[model samples]
Target: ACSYRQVYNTRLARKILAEFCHERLVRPTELSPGRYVVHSDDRETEYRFRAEILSLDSWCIDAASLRRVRKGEELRIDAIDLIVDMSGSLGIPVDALPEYLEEFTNTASISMDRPDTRRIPAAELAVADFQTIEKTMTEGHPCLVANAGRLGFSADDIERYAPESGGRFALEWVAVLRVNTDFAAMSGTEYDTLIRDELGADTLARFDRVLTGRGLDPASYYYMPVHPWQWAEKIARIYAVDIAEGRIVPVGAGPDRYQPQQSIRTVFNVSVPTRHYVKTALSIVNMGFTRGMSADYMRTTPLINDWVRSRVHGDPYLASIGFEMIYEVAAIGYRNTTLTAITRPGSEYRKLLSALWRESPVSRVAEHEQLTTMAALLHIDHNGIPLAGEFIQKSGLAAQEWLARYLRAYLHPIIYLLYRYEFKFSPHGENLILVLDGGAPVRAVLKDIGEEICIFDAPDDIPESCRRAVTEEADEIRNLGVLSDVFDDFLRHFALLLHESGLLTDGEFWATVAHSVAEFQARHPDLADRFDQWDLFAPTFPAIHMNRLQLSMVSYSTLVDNEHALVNPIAGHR
Candidate 1:
């Protein structure tokens, strides 16, 4: 039977074939020109599809052209069927397969099988407001097949809290004993100064009254926002002892309505749109990692942002290009005494309760400009239109011209930071917000700066409190920060989408990227030696094997730590 569910299934199944093949978990033999075939481990099933392999082995597969056959009978294409059929090739352990598949199903359901009433067309979404565009983003992460596997959220919880559900609700408030919580902020930022305006005067007085009414000293408690689910599911259960001891007392919900961001942990204040993005602890498993704001990092995160702000505050080049970061201004972490006494660092138990405040991107841009999660570029609407294509259409610029403009807005400042400051951050779309004017990218603002940024070379001005942000990756693989992260991790997906949509050819896309890099390099003569040391035009860069890394349950702190190499698409440009 032809149904909407099958339509979504085929679409997601095409993604599985493309991404898994790119991961080298599946080897598709070309049966003919642009036609490929993949067989199951038992050879009882086969998948045939049409695609063109582009740079970095990007699979530009046609969803409609996919056909699935089992035991000589054709069946509707499904993502889970393909995964189970080629299970042996994935290298995932037998014991972990079911757990991983559960996440996969959850991921597919949240993104593809969403209600048709919530669907927004590419044209409409192209001009939508910031929160609307944020909610409408369907593609979670281009490289990961199971990107939005929110294991802890139920169907009801997802409707209430997930970003795609476009839900807005008030935050649960709590008053933790001051002794158990530590707060840090930037210079001139006081705890009261930050929280007073956030909760408003009436709410503050109400919280104080509640604490005093309980015969508890108001001065002994620090108020913080908690994800309602965390309070109901995790804290109310595990922290029962603390609650009973009156160390952690529940207040009431705050007054401001907040919308969950695509990042999941962060929520933007919809009521006070200019207020800081309140990043609370969400103890769910998403994208192979436990989504928790670490208590330890919370202490030093804003300090790291302080050092970063000092370095990039008044740079002529950055100011000229209008590239900026929404620095984490303040953060607080509360530790349960009993749990902290036994658990060491890196334990999820220790990371259960914390919150971070990052500056708002709204105040940084003009009213005429619109904001979209940089990840929105990869999103394809249900009507089979890529948002990027619609953006180009709306901008009234040719594909190449629009592409060049965006590369300048995003790529330039990233390279500048890497070479000039020896700083490498996760430059993925989730960490970036593209500011658009008249449907074209004017500039990009970086978020989640503190925990994500890696400072390779410690400077003389580096602060003692920010030492945790410092880490030196090997010199041989330093280029991978840009090549593997910027190029392969993000641009690989964008380039293929443009190619598949016939907006631009593969060669044209890579050539423009190389040209942009060259332009940035030429503008900074003093950084030539740094560029030579970390050659952007290296013939080959190691692949990180994202899905493989997620499956092996290993670490990515070091180098590629794998045996695969992806030929640099712009290698010969030099």
Candidate 2:
């Protein structure tokens, strides 16, 4: 147990040091060539390590070579000590540092309790079904160091619900009085029909029986489902008065089973694969912010998804490539009027008791086709075989050829959105799903609709209900949706994996990416002027210090508002 904790803390320390150095939060003194030394604000803590600075100034730290000192004495590896020591130097707000450290502790504990203790071979993982690989994934966001920061989860809660634990459970249903509930659905989607279809007749009858037995009219209330953890942990205590007053009535757990995805707040129905994935508001901090859905924006969510769905369908290039979106069809928000008056719009309090239903890619897949998350490509089994390498081997195509097809499926559409319409999706691997044909990626299905979609410059054709997405930022900053999210956050890591797996040389990987850009540009010659303006081939793009942004936040309630960006590794390298 001590050894496991030591290894975990050692690795966690390595990640913290590396990312902090990359962001210049802690300026490590370069002692000769690859060695570095850093000291704490109080001169009590020191960290020394050897690292190779990779492209974009990424610190590839050697965990084995790391050592720590406290008050002129050697110390065992500890993640919290390192953060506390460097907190002032890293500009982590004093108030936020302790909370951040709690997240770090939870992250380390989860690693120790990780369910899949043994690694599956890459070859086996590569051929595994979509959901199987998804739940088994160990890695989180490539850019963020403390990627598993499920701040509010207890060890028991995590073991019961974490995707890594492969846990499945039913949702607790509640009836919220329609007066306090705001609900929306896409055209032709009725609330009753949607619930009936997903919950089936027996579950529906059971819910109705619960309402009738209490002498409450089901018609006067909207059905809202919540994560059981939230109901047991937060709701029972926080909303006790509301429950007693008959404003919110518990109707027990639903019959169908659901499993949480990599994004802890969202869940896919495992019992009925075709059912829409439900995204719920959970008051836990994971990755960056509290994992909650905005209740204030719930009414307009379906409209935004409908607007984007129409645009994607109408675009010639996207349609031809079979670009599909898992539209968020309906949403329900229970507003505590008292909470709304006291809290800001994006505050966690206002985000509680909201849910959205997004269409599942599993239901959309055709025969002879497989659906896998784009995140899977970045995965490497413990045996040191890359998932992308397995796909290349199975596709019977040259590595370059297989990778090129993948680019066409995933990359070109994001390019079209930016250059043609000034629109952008988050473009993160988790946000996109790849449709594979005979082991090769062919097309994509974009998910996490409405909230993540951005329209930097609203066109005249933009719908009235959807214009909320058209917030203005600097054009260069707007371009970051593609440059930062795609080129740096995703493709860079993907390239490293491919090169490491002997699937592609670093040169060949970037060359393929450049070729994809050229091919897209050639096809859309009409927008050549826009290309120069956004300039994917610019000599450099700004460095976005993600860890620094988190450090700057004073509290979990505030969003990460830093404007920092990093130079694009691909820029001018051609």
Candidate 3:
């Protein structure tokens, strides 16, 4: 009998082959109709697999059909060897190979070495709680195979803080002197009121007592929460001079036990579900970027949130359609005087200690409704079942009916934000949340604002403070925010799940999506000019390889493969 380790390693290898092929990092020679063979760079070893190449080059590889061979001798397929074998073809440099391997292995370890105790079946996870589904997510990113590289987190830290590790802890509190701190909030929110409501007066008194005892006036400081690992590693040591000089004081943790969101820096308040989520800055290298909240962006975050909320909240169209966005209400950033004086604005040194409080989605849904990351749609159980297929079965509706509802929930809002408002949001699966009623999607909620949104047009009302949200993409590229991001990047994987599970055919899936866009257009003929210029059902759109972009940039190497195109799946509809 094979160990679960062996079993999951096989799963990992299969996924790498599937995703790498989809990205054009690996080209397999077609042996027969559905049979393909890929060779190692040395050509000494080769592997054969069976796959169905669907629209948008979705690699639907059957895990059981994979086999490895070397010198005419069979060998067990391994993920690490797959990387080393194709390192040259994958454009992995010798100097960067080790780092890439470690990152790949870290992602694999979490997926492979995880105990079955953590496994939730598709049916069970279909009805799982919000955080339960968040923790149960096995696939980190749909396209990026080696995504879970939290380099600064040790194994113990991963267990304690990683969303997948299944644990919750309290957030560390700290009081920073106002001299180097910027507290930004929505128009009507005051720092004192927000802090008192979140921490309560008793905890505030306790923190104040600690500060007063140290001869530091509480008035000179602003209290904010930090990730415990960040406090222990970055803030405590890096700000030692500030601590000694009475510029920063360590306050005890707040009473609430919070669970980390998949975003890592953000934590949900499970202890008090209605309380705001605390998003802290932790300096960790994950997915090639130092995952830290910039001190500069911090002050502008709530302002941008306020602007976005102003535009979306009372808008009759979005409200009438059950679209909502959890806004960032307040943010705090602490700058080390020494670092600020010497370092450039984009330096990682400046991002170490910032926090934002976003409105929680817990209170938004009813008791019978289920809240889950939209990414959960792509999740598959160890038993080879897709969560979305299970949802379709449970909904007691036809596959097309369930799919139409989901498309309306997620795609409609994204389309409205772009066509109607000239606003662009990064609406990838992880950045979106879906609320389900009877296992059918009812609403779509967007998060991760202040930093990721782009304003394609600078309307007269946009505040100068939030001007950083504006981007100057051409009309064609602006359309890609809806087409490329919502369609190619996300729905491509979603379509594969539906196709492979026999839930919906590729033609049927895209047909439904095309209908959703047309129905929305029919409702708003006033925006007909915009629709004509940015055709959603054009023959083809430029393809972007997300994995290659991250790989090349993080390795500090050359840019690769920016020129490719995907035949629009809905081209026939137009």
Candidate 4:
């Protein structure tokens, strides 16, 4: 229902934890290195080198390490540096929450009485027709660029896909796109020209007539019933408006031409597995979904009692709202049940977590155990989950380096070697780049499988002879001159890790990744590519060219509705 921006400034502070005491920006040599000098009369830290802009709107600071070296001063990355870089250009972090058995609470479910057969818009009328008529007209031909999806359906072709349902199946596309734009606010200027023409408004008073929703609160309500394409255009226009209003100002900016491409290793560090654990957690209340177990109806399941019972020794919810509700009871129940189950005591909660995976439908017992063990640390009862306030304060980056190293060792080598082979052609097969926690984890991790992508000169980009020479074996030819054994070994090893991690067992993981990427790319193709490039470099993690380098830019995630040009009525209906 709500969205947030996790401040990446933490990384900056962590890197300079020994130096800077507050959460603030380090202008130039204060953090970065260079000839620049505004030396603080108070020399708490020494400058190692000059400041560098790693990417557009982002910079890196390298303070002289306590242990020095001859080349200026040895600059080692500190925790603060990692924290800032990680969250700097971050996107909206989306997580699925337990719905309290009410799945529709957060869902956007909209339905319209069948429209009377009438013209909606000229463009809409043009694209909307009997599926057969539209299909025949654009047979095997691409229609709208927006409609191109993993299924490869063009706009004209998409209608042919279960159209009578009015896009229920592709509703996945609609749901994500709507959520991605949640709380997104904008200025009225993007539609200034449209207002002048469409609304015939000459005065500023009339110009403010088009924006709507809670987003229009601080600003005036100025909006129109716009199509998906129009929505994107409106967003793009807001960028221009922001610049004009001085909301976005440029400081000595220039494009960086120096960029080096390299292979990347991709590894994923999932703190908890949602699929198995959430269901298992829910099972405490609703059990008979299990094999023909007791089939007993414990309708008013005492979830509160279960929570208190889980962590009896320490009342994590000692004074919180949960304490009055369920923590006490769950604590009492868990201690009694646990003692009864084990005939032993002393940290029985830890032992109970160790044994949770024994329940079927839950595979990879150790991971489930780990998550349960983590729950103990948080003092979570069956009824009280860790809220936002709890996470922000309690979670620490103790495992940052561990995750980085694991990914580097397990995933990057394949990408590195693949890049070594594909560097010459510069073809965009699956990019050999690997992104980590900062990028699309699924793509970054899966790209580790060497044979997953095939690079090729565009059929049009290549000569006719080259196109004719291409075969279904074109993927094989892409590997020409490269040692097959090397690539095979990479794939073999990559597959094994995924298998060992139990990621491969659930075919749905692949489905989830594919669905997410397809949704994201349609909205923000450029951002998606940056994630690919970042993971490619972050692991070996070389010296990033502050503002001028690809790795230097901030990262964000993107999402979209069905690959169609979505049109939502921004006014009138609400």
TM-score of each: 0.97, 0.89, 0.97, 0.19
Candidate order by TM-score, decreasing, is 1, 3, 2, 4
For each candidate, the alpha-carbon lDDT, in order, equals 0.86, 0.77, 0.85, 0.22
lDDT of 3: 0.85
Against the true structure, candidate 3 reaches a TM-score of 0.97
Summing lDDT over every window of 10 consecutive residues in candidate 4, give the lowest-scoring window. Answer: 138-147
Winner of 3 and 4 under TM-score: 3
lDDT of 1 by residue, 1-574 (tens): 2126766777788878888888788889998999999998889998888998899989989776788888999998888888888778888788988998998899888755788888888999998898898898877888888888898998899998999988899898899988899898887677989998788899999988898999999899889989998889889999889999999988899889999998877899999999988998889999878878777888888888888888887899999999988888999999987898898888999777899888998888888999989998898887778999989998888899899899889888888999898888888888899999889879998887888788889878789877877776777788887898899999999998899889999999999988988988899999999999999999987887778767763313453745678989998788
Write one digit per residue (lDDT tens) for candidate 4, span 518-570. Answer: 34334445454433532321211111111111111211011111231211111
What TM-score should be assigned to candidate 2? 0.89
Model 4 regions lying over 4 Å from their true place: 1-11, 14-444, 447-546, 550-574
Regions of candidate 1 where Cα sits further than 4 Å from its true position: 1-3, 553-562
Which whole-number lDDT from 0 to 100 does residue 524 have in model 1?
A: 96
Please give, for residues 137-199, the per-residue lDDT of candidate 2 as tens digits. 766777676678887788788888887777789899999999999899887687989988888
- The number of residue pairs in model 3 that clash at the backbone is 0
Candidate 2 residue spans exceeding 4 A from truth: 1-14, 29-52, 61-85, 93-96, 116-119, 338-344, 460-464, 500-502, 553-567
